[PDB]
Amino acid sequence: YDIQAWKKQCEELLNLIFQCEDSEPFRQPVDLLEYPDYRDIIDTPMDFATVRETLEAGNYESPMELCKDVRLIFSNSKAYTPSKRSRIYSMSLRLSAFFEEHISSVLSDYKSALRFHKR
Numbered sequence: 354y355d356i357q358a359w360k361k362q363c364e365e366l367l368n369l370i371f372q373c374e375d376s377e378p379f380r381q382p383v384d385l386l387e388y389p390d391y392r393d394i395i396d397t398p399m400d401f402a403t404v405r406e407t408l409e410a411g412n413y414e415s416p417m418e419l420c421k422d423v424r425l426i427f428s429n430s431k432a433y434t435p436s437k438r439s440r441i442y443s444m445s446l447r448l449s450a451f452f453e454e455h456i457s458s459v460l461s462d463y464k465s466a467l468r469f470h471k472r
């Protein structure tokens with residue numbers, strides 16, 4: 354029933370993701386000196402520090418908005434990878450499975466709490 358519970362649930366999930374070795378390439382923006390053509394392929398860079406900062410600033414209204422930004426991290430990895438067998442893309446696939454496994458109840462609980470609020 355708690356309409357606000359998603360925020361701490363997302364903070365905790367972000368903490369687990371930061372602790373995970375698979376999040377290393379995604380903890381800060383992609384290095385434009387290392388990948389000089391990055392912005393010719395990727396329109397909207399996104400990373401987990403930006404997600405965490407947006408959440409802490411009180412700039413997400415729902416866990417759906419947070420989930421859209423996290424999914425953008427993974428779609429940017431899929432778009433920039435030169436191959437399906439690349440190291441960073443392989444890490445993003447595992448991290449995405451972990452994120453999706455944990456975010457499902459956060460989204461369901463929030464949507465259920467909002468429906469209860471409007472019963």
Ligand SMILES: Cc1ccc(OCC(=O)N2CC[NH+](C)CC2)cc1
Pocket residue numbers: 383429430433434435436439440441442
């Ligand atoms: C965001 C992104 C996504 C996929 C990439 O695929 C190539 C890769 O994973 N590497 C080749 C270059 N090494 C220095 C690191 C390993 C690279 C960057």
